[PDB]
Design a protein around this ligand. Structure first.
Ligand SMILES: CCCCCCCCCCCCCCCCCC(=O)OC[C@H](COP(=O)(O)OC[C@H](N)C(=O)O)OC(=O)CCCCCCCCCCCCCCCCC
Ligand SMILES: CCCCCCCCCCCCCCCCCC(=O)OC[C@H](COP(=O)(O)OC[C@H](N)C(=O)O)OC(=O)CCCCCCCCCCCCCCCCC
Ligand SMILES: CCCCCCCCCCCCCCCCCC(=O)OC[C@H](COP(=O)(O)OC[C@H](N)C(=O)O)OC(=O)CCCCCCCCCCCCCCCCC
Ligand SMILES: CCCCCCCC/C=C\CCCCCCCC(=O)O[C@@H](COC(=O)CCCCCCCCCCCCCCC)COP(=O)([O-])OCC[N+](C)(C)C
Ligand SMILES: CCCCCCCC/C=C\CCCCCCCC(=O)O[C@@H](COC(=O)CCCCCCCCCCCCCCC)COP(=O)([O-])OCC[N+](C)(C)C
Ligand SMILES: CCCCCCCC/C=C\CCCCCCCC(=O)O[C@@H](COC(=O)CCCCCCCCCCCCCCC)COP(=O)([O-])OCC[N+](C)(C)C
Ligand SMILES: CCCCCCCCCCCCCCCCCCCC(=O)O[C@H](COC(=O)CCCCCCCCCCCCCC)COP(=O)(O)OCCN
Ligand SMILES: CCCCCCCCCCCCCCCCCCCC(=O)O[C@H](COC(=O)CCCCCCCCCCCCCC)COP(=O)(O)OCCN
Ligand SMILES: CCCCCCCCCCCCCCCCCCCC(=O)O[C@H](COC(=O)CCCCCCCCCCCCCC)COP(=O)(O)OCCN
Ligand SMILES: CCCCCCCCCCCCCCCCCCCC(=O)O[C@H](COC(=O)CCCCCCCCCCCCCC)COP(=O)(O)OCCN
Ligand SMILES: Nc1ncnc2c1ncn2[C@@H]1O[C@H](COP(=O)(O)OP(=O)(O)OP(=O)(O)O)[C@@H](O)[C@H]1O
Ligand SMILES: Nc1ncnc2c1ncn2[C@@H]1O[C@H](COP(=O)(O)OP(=O)(O)OP(=O)(O)O)[C@@H](O)[C@H]1O
Ligand SMILES: Nc1ncnc2c1ncn2[C@@H]1O[C@H](COP(=O)(O)OP(=O)(O)OP(=O)(O)O)[C@@H](O)[C@H]1O
Ligand SMILES: *[C@@H]1O[C@H](CO)[C@@H](O[C@@H]2O[C@H](CO)[C@@H](O)[C@H](O)[C@H]2NC(C)=O)[C@H](O)[C@H]1NC(C)=O
Ligand SMILES: [K+]
Lengths: 145, 483, 38, 364, 335
């Protein structure tokens, strides 16, 4: 759904005002690079998140089935200073995943804004009905979304 | 013919009555400080100060911030915007003439490049602690202030008022230059690096001293905090070597689980001590979360409201552009007066720039909101897990408190309830930010289409209850499928 | 926003229930008062 | 948008094959041992918590004098261009303010007037003219079609400023160029170090030999050799120094560090009682806390600048039981050095024990 | 009371006071030498003033020669007569005032030569003044370029960068007392061919009655190959082992508070960047020697690199040590 909406939008942008698609070539280039690097890092980041939550649960279960033993050995701090490390690894995995997502969103939003500018400027200086200015504006605005 | 500055009219170069009483001379005097700044600062930046006078193999790892850092960035970006507006107005006004009046917009373009170079110069100074050099910036701002002030009073002697756009733009620029000079003065006051005998003793944050802290969000300048630029390296390192647990090194001491657990424990203890004296009052976790993670939620809501306000610039600019492009401009008569403060917003080429800037600002605000509330939710989750563990250690093994299904309850409380609470804390700002946006959208619909917009809003609004019903039925089906 | 409002409200309900469960767990019998005197 | 908000299905994802069978826990991903001095002869530590002594404006100048020739030209050109432009703006402003631009325009509209009696600087009427005048005053061409009259003293003040600033810039740039001309042979260091250091046997005792050679044609005057062993050591009273550097003598018939280096040389240290490597055997030299540093110092006769070249060897580089093939072999009528055989090593038979044990039962 | 007299302060700079020296004559070479070594704040001022003074002096000369000749009168009467009766009679054309004389001097001495004030070929005295001005301007220009060249040359060198610990220790290391201090470097470069020397300044008396006020005694620093050369990348602990001939042999632990001692440390070397030999000095007195301490370790391994921690550079922790003089530990071996 998303890719078809994007394709139809840029198609109508180009048809309404051809001068846009000469500016299409740089933007597309940029997009490709983004679509590369994110997809390479994202998997790795996900491969950490799902991997750092399995031990964090396991630990709890142990310290719930053997609480009497731990309080016998008086080894409580040895377990707390480990639980903290586990939860910190998990939290940093989440934080880096969210930062990667925000990086992607900012980059693609700036690409969308550049598209809006290079379509609006072409449409402002053009010879076509106001309908084909409004269509261009609206579709180049939705591309951003 | 030729390319003059004050125009092609001879009587525009007269300096009989006074130099100040000739507007073009005031424009030139405004153009001067920018070029002075550029010529002072381009050689300094090109040469560098890379003279290895100290062990810098671990001095390049750490940096520092001066007293006024965020305020400086916000003010410089605002000044950039004001200069873009001045460039635009000058170009529009000049295109309604016979000659080319370079005194309308060339000072503004020089000011744009000079302000950009000013912020580059400030960053490159700050990264390598060197406060003395920023004295140069000081001089710049003062000079600029003076010059702009003169322009203002000379406008004010003609009584141009705030109804004329140039007067407003110049006044805004005057006060922004004043604020920036104040920032520089305060930096001089706090660091004591020029006119004092004993400078300050300043060291980088303790976190950059450790070589394992690789999450650099809290430690970087506001333009990199706002674009996640610092991330680039790590992501581009996804090709050379796939990420391991070592690349995402460690957490800064402000985001570790122990610190937030301390904060939440102390807040809960304050609540419980207050409640114990009260006769029949039950404990509350809600108020413990607030007063310990409540400031960043307000900051998220502020960014969210700013993004929601800027979001409406799409429809408005679209309406302006379309209702301007309808009519050909051949009919209109020649008008040689400076463009009206309403005729600035009426253009077809100004509004494109305004829409562009509005989009790139709204997106940044929105992502800032998302990130702040996400980080708060994650810290709260870490604190909650720490608290639940410290309660698990102090538990009784009696069968009147334990039960045939108690490890299951604990497993759910760690694996499900914490995640549900966290993902609520993420979406908390939408509770009191969505109604504002929807109401304002309906207001604009009404003021754009009469009372048919009320019918349209009534039709669309039903989207939420329908989705709620579908969601409930879907959840029940998913539960049966899981069983 | 109209689409996401349903999810936000549902998450609000589940969060309320979760805090209730958390309070119920935090009110339980505990071992001590003999090791507290050192 | 909101990928996995619903979070029910977990806590029962069964253990992977590498989890239950314990194939993953075989990490074998230890970080490499931390070197003290790199193989490239560059010390790499991390000093921290050093009180920053700020900066000094002298540092910008110190950088300016030491720059690549591809940056000296750029700063040269930029400084001169910026100076001409700044003073061009000053001259154009003076012409504007005095009423000379207007006067020239009005008397050139009807150019038959031809009056230039009262002007700060003659024949300056636009900004192009101001730029050309500033070029002719800073570079001291002085064509003389745009004179400096005795009319307005602000112009004379700007002229004095411009002459002095031009002199300052010219002197500084000539100084930079001359300094870069004086340091014309100062390029780089060309001392070649063998890659593997053998531990052979020579005259009945072991050794620790490596090879060192030159590439520059310029001789090295009073060359000196220092060799050190870096390891953590503890006194009997029990004080642990993490990195102790202990000096090991170099074999020489007159007990000196002076090496005469024209053809490549072999540098041996013989493993006697006090030697740090007295108690090391070939089977121990697989995992061992051991880093041997070598420092050669001298003065290149051309420039007369002292040079110090360093290197370091660890347990992996040492080739116990080898020796060095003879690089030098006579040509038809002249000694010759086949530098392609520099670091090449040959294998020979040597005892596998340590010198600690090789002289307690000598007849082996 | 008054602090006891020292030999070398805690930052070098020997605190002696030489007096009665047979003072020599003061030479102009001293003035020139002072000129060639200066601070930029003063270099710029002398640079500017030389040119201003020269332009003004020769402006006065040119104005006087335009006065003595019939020049000013001719150019003042030409305006009245409205005819160029002063084109060729003039000593130097179009010089009719002091402002114009100043402009002409600037043009001649900076070699602009605009050419509105041309050099006529009538008055020989003017030609003499012109030759004199050109020679003087050339000399001054060469001198000032030479000063700037010297500034640029000696620009690279900067201030000292060797860090010494505030006070020393006297520990037991490998079964003997040793006097130790720690030396570190903050510089980025390498001190090529460094060296360490230790001396004891003390008032000594000879059996024959020759009393030496402040005698400097040489202390053999302890190295496993008996040499000075020290390689300095991570801070070192210089040590000296108190043997039968060290002056610190008989000084006990109790009476180290009141004992005429001073240990001077001189550390020399050659920097790599500029090849300018440097010497750094320090001294320790009785009050700043802590018996029975030892310096704490500073370098920790971060599993990728070693990492010196200079915050603990001068830290020193207390340990056990035989609380007696170094003589009693061998003449009375049982202790
Ligand atoms: C004629 C006029 C003349 C004026 C007369 C003089 C007036 C005096 C006022 C100037 C005082 C300047 C002192 C600076 C205050 C510093 C206070 C202190 O530093 O804490 C301020 C805090 C702390 O962050 P930091 O210290 O800046 O360092 C950043 C680092 N990362 C850190 O947080 O450790 O940082 C913060 O808490 C951030 C605060 C941001 C405040 C900005 C609010 C946004 C308002 C938006 C305005 C936009 C600009 C105008 C738009 C116009 C559009 C046309
Ligand atoms: C706001 C303003 C904007 C300004 C925009 C920028 C303006 C730039 C304009 C000019 C740009 C020029 C840059 C070109 C870069 C080429 C550099 C080229 O000279 O390299 C050749 C070398 C460069 O050695 P290095 O890499 O620096 O290393 C330093 C040293 N070798 C070392 O290793 O440690 O260099 C040398 O080795 C020495 C070169 C000497 C130069 C030659 C002069 C000729 C005099 C001798 C007479 C010959 C006759 C010439 C007549 C020619 C006829 C026209
Ligand atoms: C448009 C520009 C583009 C071209 C630029 C490219 C580069 C070309 C020009 C290069 C500029 C010359 C390099 C100067 C190097 C800076 C040295 C800086 O240290 O001194 C600035 C002074 C510092 O005083 P200091 O401590 O004594 O310094 C010496 C140092 N202690 C040492 O090691 O030894 O800082 C101070 O403490 C200030 C005190 C006063 C200093 C200056 C006094 C000014 C006197 C006169 C100057 C005006 C000249 C014109 C007069 C005209 C009159 C009509
Ligand atoms: C290695 C070459 C490097 C420098 C090359 C640029 C020099 C060109 C100067 C020039 O074009 O004349 C300009 C001088 O005003 C200036 O342009 C000042 C020149 C300073 C250049 C600084 C660049 C950074 C004049 O501008 P114009 O465009 O000639 O307009 C004249 C009016 N007209 C339209 C009737 C013609
Ligand atoms: C980076 C390259 C530098 C190039 C700058 C000059 C630009 C071309 C020159 C130009 O615009 O002509 C104008 C200078 O207009 C100005 O004053 C511009 C000054 C900007 C300085 C740029 C510094 C960087 C000429 O303006 P005018 O002196 O007022 O002309 C007199 C009127 N008349 C010609 C009809 C008699
Ligand atoms: C640092 C810049 C200094 C440059 C200053 C220029 C003006 C000096 C004062 C002055 O009014 O000049 C006057 C004298 O001036 C003198 O007589 C001063 C001579 C001694 C001055 C020594 C210290 C300088 C020159 O005027 P005039 O020589 O009398 O000219 C006669 C012809 N006229 C009357 C038609 C004009
Ligand atoms: C608008 C703002 C523009 C600001 C001017 C540029 C400076 C910004 C970067 C700061 C910086 O110092 O980088 C310089 C870029 O040099 C470069 O690599 C580019 C110049 C190369 C010319 C060929 C290096 O400066 P450096 O290479 O000259 O210093 C070498 C020894 N310090
Ligand atoms: C914002 C950063 C990007 C700038 C976007 C503007 C791109 C260029 C548009 C310029 C333009 O065609 O319209 C001019 C006004 O625009 C402006 O005023 C934009 C000024 C931006 C400078 C930064 C007046 O163009 P015109 O009315 O004279 O006629 C020309 C067609 N008819
Ligand atoms: C608001 C919308 C702005 C749209 C353009 C933003 C581009 C982001 C460039 C600025 C940036 O990334 O930050 C600098 C990066 O420098 C750089 O790497 C050069 C920036 C090149 C683009 C300007 C600061 O660098 P830092 O604060 O991260 O460094 C700190 C430790 N050295
Ligand atoms: C223009 C309209 C919006 C302006 C908002 C200014 C925000 C500037 C930064 C604010 C800031 O950093 O403080 C945060 C709270 O922000 C806030 O609470 C901002 C409140 C919303 C103002 C409207 C953190 O809060 P904190 O850590 O300072 O809280 C402990 C009190 N000492
Ligand atoms: N013929 C040569 N020319 C220049 N440099 C050499 C030569 N032979 C060896 N080197 C230097 O020796 C150092 C180590 O090189 P490397 O370990 O690749 O081989 P090697 O042990 O020197 O001898 P070989 O190259 O024969 O194996 C390198 O830094 C290289 O510069
Ligand atoms: N106060 C002083 N300043 C500089 N040099 C001195 C001073 N006193 C002595 N000298 C140097 O010491 C040497 C002493 O030899 P000289 O021939 O002067 O014997 P003298 O005059 O008997 O000495 P004095 O008068 O010092 O006892 C001379 O070479 C002189 O240069
Ligand atoms: N981390 C450091 N960075 C830079 N210089 C240092 C550092 N530590 C010590 N020094 C220098 O070493 C000298 C000796 O300091 P030492 O550690 O022996 O005593 P201290 O307690 O540091 O005294 P002070 O507080 O006066 O420096 C000091 O003069 C100081 O200049
Ligand atoms: C050029 O000069 C002035 C700008 O101040 C304009 O105003 C004219 O100036 C003369 C005086 O010289 C007045 O008498 C006229 O009434 C003014 N004419 C007008 C307002 O049309 C002048 O118009 C400018 N343009 C020209 C001469 O073409
Ligand atoms: K001439």
């Amino acid at each position: 759904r998303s890719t078809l909406l994007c394709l139809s939008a840029i198609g109508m942008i180009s048809y309404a005002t051809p001068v846009f698609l000469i500016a299409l070539a740089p933007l597309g280039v940029a997009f490709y690079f983004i679509q590369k690097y994110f997809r390479v890092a994202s998997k790795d980041l996900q491969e950490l998140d799902d991997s750092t939550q399995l031990p964090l649960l396991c630990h709890f279960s142990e310290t719930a089935e053997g609480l009497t033993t731990i309080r016998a050995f008086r080894h409580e701090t040895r377990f707390k200073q480990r639980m903290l490390e586990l939860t910190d690894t998990n939290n940093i995995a989440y934080l880096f995943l969210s930062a990667a997502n925000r990086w992607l969103e900012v980059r693609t939003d700036y690409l969308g804004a550049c598209i809006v500018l290079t379509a609006s400027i072409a449409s402002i200086s053009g010879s076509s009905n106001s309908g084909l200015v409004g269509l261009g504006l609206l579709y180049a605005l939705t591309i951003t979304n | 013919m030729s390319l003059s500055f004050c125009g092609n009219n001879i009587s525009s170069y007269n300096i009989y009555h006074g130099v100040l009483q000739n507007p073009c001379f005031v424009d030139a005097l405004n153009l001067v400080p920018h070029v002075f700044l550029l010529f002072i600062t381009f050689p300094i930046l090109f040469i560098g100060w890379g003279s290895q006078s100290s062990k810098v193999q671990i001095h390049h790892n750490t940096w520092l911030h001066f007293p006024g850092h965020n305020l400086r960035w916000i003010l410089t970006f605002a000044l950039l915007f004001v200069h873009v507006c001045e460039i635009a107005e000058g170009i529009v006004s000049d295109s309604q003439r016979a000659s080319r009046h370079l005194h309308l917009f060339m000072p503004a373009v020089m000011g744009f490049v000079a302000t950009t170079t000013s912020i580059v110069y400030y960053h490159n100074i700050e990264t390598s602690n060197f406060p003395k050099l920023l004295l140069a910036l000081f001089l710049y701002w003062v000079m600029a202030f003076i010059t702009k002030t003169i322009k203002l009073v000379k406008y004010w002697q003609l009584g141009w008022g705030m109804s004329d756009l140039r007067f407003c733009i110049t006044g805004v620029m005057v006060i922004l230059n004043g604020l920036l000079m104040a920032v520089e003065i305060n930096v001089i006051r706090v660091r004591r690096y020029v006119f004092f005998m004993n400078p300050q003793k300043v060291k980088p944050p303790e976190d950059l001293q450790d070589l394992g802290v690789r999450f650099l969000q809290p430690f970087v300048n506001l333009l990199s905090k706002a674009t996640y630029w610092w991330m680039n390296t790590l992501i581009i390192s996804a090709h050379r070597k796939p990420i391991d647990l070592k690349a995402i090194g460690k957490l800064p001491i402000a985001m570790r689980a122990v610190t937030n657990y301390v904060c939440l424990k102390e807040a809960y203890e304050e609540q419980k001590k207050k409640a114990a004296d009260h006769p029949n009052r039950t404990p509350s976790i809600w108020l413990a979360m607030y007063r310990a993670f409540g400031r960043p939620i307000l900051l998220s809501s502020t960014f969210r409201y700013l993004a929601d306000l800027l979001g409406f610039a799409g429809p408005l600019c679209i309406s302006g552009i379309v209702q301007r492009v309808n009519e050909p401009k051949n009919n209109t008569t020649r008008f040689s007066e400076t463009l009206s403060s309403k005729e600035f917003l009426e253009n077809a080429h100004v509004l494109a720039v305004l829409l562009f800037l509005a989009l790139i600002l709204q997106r940044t605000f929105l992502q800032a909101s998302y990130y702040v509330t996400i980080e708060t939710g994650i810290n709260l989750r870490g604190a909650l897990l720490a608290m639940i563990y410290n309660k698990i250690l102090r538990l009784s093994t009696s069968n009147l408190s334990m039960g045939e299904m108690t490890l299951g309850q604990i497993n759910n409380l760690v694996a499900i309830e914490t995640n549900q609470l966290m993902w609520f804390l993420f979406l908390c700002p939408n509770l009191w930010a969505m109604p504002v946006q929807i109401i304002m959208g309906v207001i604009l619909l009404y003021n754009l289409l009469g009372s048919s917009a009320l019918v349209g809003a009534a039709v669309i609004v039903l989207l939420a209850p329908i989705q709620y019903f579908i969601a409930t039925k879907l959840a029940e089906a998913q539960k049966s499928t899981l069983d | 926003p109209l689409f996401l409002l349903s999810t936000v409200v549902r998450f609000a309900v589940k969060a309320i229930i979760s805090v209730q469960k958390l309070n119920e767990f935090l009110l339980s019998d505990e071992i001590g008062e003999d090791s507290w005197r050192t | 948008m909101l990928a996995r908000k619903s979070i029910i299905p977990e806590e029962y994802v069964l253990a992977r094959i590498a989890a239950e069978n314990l194939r993953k826990p075989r990490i074998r991903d230890r970080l490499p041992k931390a070197r003290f001095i790199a193989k490239s002869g560059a010390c790499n530590l991390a000093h921290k918590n050093i009180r920053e002594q700020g900066r000094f404006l002298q540092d910008i100048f110190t950088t300016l004098v030491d720059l690549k020739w591809r940056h000296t030209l750029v700063i040269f050109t930029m400084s001169f261009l910026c100076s001409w432009l700044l003073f061009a703006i000053m001259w154009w402003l003076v012409a504007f303010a005095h009423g000379d631009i207007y006067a020239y325009m009005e008397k050139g509209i009807t150019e038959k007037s031809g009056l230039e009696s009262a002007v700060c600087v003659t024949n300056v009427r636009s900004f192009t003219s101001a730029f050309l005048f500033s070029i002719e005053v800073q570079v001291t061409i002085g064509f003389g079609g745009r004179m400096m009259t005795e009319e307005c003293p602000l112009a004379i003040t700007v002229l004095i400023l411009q002459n002095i600033v031009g002199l300052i810039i010219n002197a500084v740039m000539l100084g930079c160029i001359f300094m870069k001309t004086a340091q014309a042979h100062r390029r780089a260091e060309t001392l070649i170090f063998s890659r593997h250091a053998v531990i052979a046997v020579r005259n009945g005792k072991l050794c620790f030999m490596f090879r060192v050679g030159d590439l520059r044609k310029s001789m090295i005057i009073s060359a000196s050799v220092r060799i050190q062993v870096v390891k953590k050591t503890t006194t009997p009273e029990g004080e642990v120094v993490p990195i102790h550097q202990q000096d090991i003598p170099v074999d020489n018939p007159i007990e000196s560090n002076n090496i005469f280096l024209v053809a490549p040389l072999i540098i041996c240290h013989v493993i006697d009682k006090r030697s740090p490597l007295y108690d090391i055997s070939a089977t121990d030299l697989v995992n061992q806390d051991l880093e041997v540093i070598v420092i050669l110092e001298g003065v290149v006769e051309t420039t007369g600048i002292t040079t110090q070249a360093r290197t370091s060897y660890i347990a992996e580089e040492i080739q116990w039981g080898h020796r060095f093939v003879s690089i030098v072999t006579e040509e038809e009528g002249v000694y010759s050095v086949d530098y392609s055989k520099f670091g090449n090593t040959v294998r020979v038979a040597a005892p596998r024990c340590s010198a600690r044990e090789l002289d307690e039962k000598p007849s082996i």
